[PDB]
Structure 1
Amino acid sequence: VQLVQSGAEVKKPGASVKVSCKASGYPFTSYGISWVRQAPGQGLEWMGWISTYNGNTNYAQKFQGRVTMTTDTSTTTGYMELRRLRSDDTAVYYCARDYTRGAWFGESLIGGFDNWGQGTLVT
């Protein structure tokens, strides 16, 4: 199993960025995609979780109304669109396979984020 993301980008405040993630080595439908942010010098922040099966998405309050997550099962990918970027959003955005929540039922699971991508840096 391996997750791979897009390269770094630089944006001015008010701009939007689309951060892509692709994955392989497992059936896509059964695992969700977790987005985790890490600003330089900071710890990890959960942004949201999207079901690759039904499109249901949960978001951390800090990003509600700002981030839209989507999936495409035909290419084994997911995307995170961040609207109205601020200088406060300079961070590495990580894509991780997520087994802490059920892809089909939306319920909490006993697990964690096992396979992570390299992290996409957005300025």
Structure 2
Amino acid sequence: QVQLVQSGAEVKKPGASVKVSCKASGYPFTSYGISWVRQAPGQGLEWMGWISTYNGNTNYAQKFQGRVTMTTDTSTTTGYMELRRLRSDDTAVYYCARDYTRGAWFGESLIGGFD
């Protein structure tokens, strides 16, 4: 059974940075990439990041072009994410997902989604 585990709540203050980890199990980690979405309380979902778990290639949106950094570890199959320059509009809920829209090896776009 594909299981994804996320970290706990963060009480970081403005002017600081937030580090969050996602853990995956029950499926081939290398076969698929890792995507991360976000949702503001009372608003719709909002994609923020994608990364291929094979070569370390990463993709960001224009809104978060230079606000976040990411790393991945294949030894434990974990994803660490640093969000910088917090604002009062950053209170939300972030979600981990297995991306099936972009390839892990070459980045070719696939037909699918976060399953």
Cα displacement (A) at 1:84: 1.1
CA RMSD of aligned residues (A): 0.7
**TM-score normalized by structure 2?**
0.96
For the residue of structure 1 that corresponds to 2:89, the secondary structure is helix
CA shift for structure 1 position 27:
1.3
Q: CA deviation at 1:11?
A: 1.2
Q: TM-score, normalised by structure 1?
A: 0.90
How far off its partner does 1:101 sit?
0.5
| Greater percentage in helix | 1
In structure 2, stretches of 5+ residues that fail to align are: none
**Percent of aligned pairs with the same amino acid:** 100
CA offset digits 1:35-85 (Å, max 9, x no partner): 101010011111010111011000011111111111000001111110111
- What 5-or-longer segments of structure 1 have no aligned partner? 115-123
Q: Distance in 1 between matches of 2:68 and 2:32?
A: 20
Task: Compare relative contact order (CA 8 Å, sep 6+) and give the higher one, 1 or 2.
Answer: 1
Take 1:69 and 1:50, find their aligned partners in 2: how far apart are those partners? 8
CA drift of 1:15 comes to 0.7
Which stretches of structure 1, 4 residues or more, deviate above 3 A after TM superposition?
Answer: none
- Kindly state the Cα deviation for residue 87 of structure 1 after the two structures are TM-superposed: 1.2
